[PDB]
């Protein structure tokens, strides 16, 4: 997997990282470092934490530790 | 345990055994595999779970929409014991015993059966009473003592029926989980008695007109006589 990641980096350095290339690199690194099985959707974490990206106005805005 | 007798239920029901039925079962509602036609695998935890949860809600259990009953309420549990004792021993026999050992054989056996039934009912209701100790009421605790007295069972404060544990070798008793069995019945009942005595003391301390004066006087006299009869003080 590390050899594959190195080849991917060598391919993508010249033309700049793409969204799919970055996603594949993240998946490869996670697989390399994993010691267990991931049974949850990867996009679930992003869906939950999208409140860190989308900004809410007013006093109703959400911040860590409400 | 869902569709049958549960935590504080009195009726004894073996869900696997098809007792109380007029028909030989032809269709098994909870079926997971076609092989269960000849290999139902009942008794196994998962398949038994499927079957019991497929069973409909009987009178003991209640449906998700029907309003349940607060069976875990001390104010209901105590009068249940009082009614049990009343049914077991008639008013005439209770009056005769209070006035008075010269009793008929039928009356003696009736008293013994009443004591046995009261012990079984206490065993069944013990978890609910233990859970409901916290938010009970002084009147209901006094009623607990009165019901014990009426049933004629002397609580094990440290005739008598709670003091002796039921016979049976420990290697054959039903230890299966999920069934509300109380093997240390005398110890649990003694702990419950101590807890209710302490709760009565706390309620009196918290409580500390002619109507209220008379209520306090009668309550004190009751508490005193009932605790003296059961062999307790304060």
């Amino acid at each position: 997997m590390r050899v594959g990641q190195n080849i991917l980096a060598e391919e993508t350095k010249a033309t700049g990282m793409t969204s799919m290339d970055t996603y594949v690199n993240s998946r490869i690194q996670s697989i390399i470092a994993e010691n267990t099985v991931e049974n949850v959707a990867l996009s679930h974490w992003r869906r939950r934490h999208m409140w860190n990206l989308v900004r809410t106005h007013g006093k109703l805005q959400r911040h860590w530790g409400v | 345990v869902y569709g049958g007798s549960g935590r504080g239920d009195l009726l004894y029901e073996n869900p696997d055994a098809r007792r109380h039925s007029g028909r030989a079962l032809g269709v098994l509602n909870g079926v997971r595999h076609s092989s269960q036609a000849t290999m139902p695998e009942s008794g196994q935890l998962y398949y038994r779970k499927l079957i019991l949860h497929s069973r409909p809600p009987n009178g003991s259990c209640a449906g998700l929409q029907r309003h349940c009953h607060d069976t875990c309420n001390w104010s209901y549990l105590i009068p249940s014991l009082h009614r049990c004792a009343e049914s077991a021993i008639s008013a005439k026999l209770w009056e005769k015993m209070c006035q008075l050992v010269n009793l008929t054989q039928y009356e003696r056996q009736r008293v013994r059966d009443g004591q046995n039934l009261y012990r079984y009912e206490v065993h069944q209701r013990l978890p609910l009473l233990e859970e409901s100790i916290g938010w009970a009421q002084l009147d209901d605790l006094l009623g607990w003592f009165r019901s014990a007295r009426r049933a004629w069972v002397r609580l094990p404060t440290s005739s008598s029926a709670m003091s002796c544990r039921l016979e049976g070798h420990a290697d054959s008793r039903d230890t299966t989980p999920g069934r509300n069995q109380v093997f240390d019945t005398p110890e649990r009942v003694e702990q419950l008695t101590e807890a209710t005595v302490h709760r009565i003391r706390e309620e009196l301390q918290r409580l500390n007109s002619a109507r209220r004066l008379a209520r306090d006087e009668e309550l004190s006299r009751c508490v005193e006589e009932e605790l003296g009869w059961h062999g307790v003080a304060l």
Binding site: - | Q105, Y106, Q109, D113
Partner: protein, 304 residues
């Protein structure tokens, strides 16, 4: 237990047995040496496999000619048998036979005959003569065809093959008879031959049975369950007949009890005697009137 290629050592032991049968006693002894080494290393002390391989090694030594070595090995085998617990009846019988043969080779005819007689008494006093054919006695009843495939109605299983202890003792008694004839003794030969005959008679008797359906039977294949069961053998039946081996009947778990022990019946909460349960009571006034005193007379009969 330490790991040992018991499969390979069993191959060697089988090869040694083949050499014994073929008369290559030196080769059998050489193979048994390795087998005994392996078993001694593997199994714990006073083990059935160890004593058995020592028996085989003693036999190989005796056949080769090392009579003293064979005698020492069989003596150690007997010591191990004494030390062990619940030794195999067949194994001890074979050990006694081997000891007798070794003593005969040495020239101790009297001691060999004594060993044979000891084996005979041991088997007679601690052997079941019907257990071998317990499941083989009702096999003839399986057969459902008479014109063809009727060999199943006469299927025969030899006790010499299905009870090795019997064969061992038979051979030991034959050798004892031969020794008695060589010595010139008559009473010993007569008694040993008679005991051998009685042993074979016991085996046959346990094997005996009558014939069920003879001609062809169509269908009724579910009768096989009845045909093959734990059918008691004649010896077991005679030993544990219902009267000699009485059945313990505890009245605590029974309702009806003898007249004198009417109080030892299953206890009841509070029971009262109503009547003798006379079915005619239901009929009418005259029918009931014709039985008024029956209960009183029965009570007087069962008084005390």
């Amino acid at each position: 237990r330490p790991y040992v290629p018991l499969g390979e050592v069993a191959k060697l032991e089988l090869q040694g047995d083949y050499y014994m049968e073929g008369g290559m006693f030196q080769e059998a002894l050489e193979h048994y040496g390795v087998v005994a080494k392996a078993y001694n290393y593997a199994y714990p002390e006073n083990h059935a496999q160890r004593i058995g391989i020592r028996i085989k090694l003693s036999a190989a030594f005796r056949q080769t000619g090392r009579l003293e070595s064979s005698l020492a090995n069989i003596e150690e085998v007997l010591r191990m048998l004494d030390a062990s617990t619940r030794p195999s009846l067949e194994l001890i019988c074979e050990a006694l036979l081997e000891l007798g043969i070794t003593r005969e080779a040495l020239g101790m005819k009297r001691e060999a005959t004594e060993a044979y007689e000891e084996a005979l008494e041991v088997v007679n006093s601690f052997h079941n003569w019907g257990e071998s054919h317990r499941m083989l006695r009702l096999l003839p009843r399986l057969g459902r065809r008479f014109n063809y495939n009727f060999e199943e109605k006469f299927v025969y299983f030899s006790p010499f093959d299905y009870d090795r202890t019997f064969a061992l003792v038979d051979q030991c008694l034959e050798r004892a008879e031969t020794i008695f004839n060589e010595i010139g003794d008559v009473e010993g030969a007569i008694r040993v031959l008679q005991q051998r005959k009685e042993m074979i008679d016991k085996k046959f008797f346990n094997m005996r049975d009558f014939a069920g359906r003879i001609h062809t039977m169509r269908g009724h294949w579910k009768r096989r369950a009845q045909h093959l069961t734990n059918a008691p053998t004649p010896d077991e039946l005679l030993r544990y007949s219902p009267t000699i081996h009485q059945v313990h009947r505890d009245f605590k778990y029974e309702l009806t009890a003898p007249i004198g022990r009417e109080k030892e019946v299953m206890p009841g909460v509070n029971r009262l005697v109503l009547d003798m349960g006379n079915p005619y009571r239901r009929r009418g006034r005259l029918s009931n009137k014709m039985l008024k005193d029956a209960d009183h007379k029965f009570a007087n009969y069962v008084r005390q």
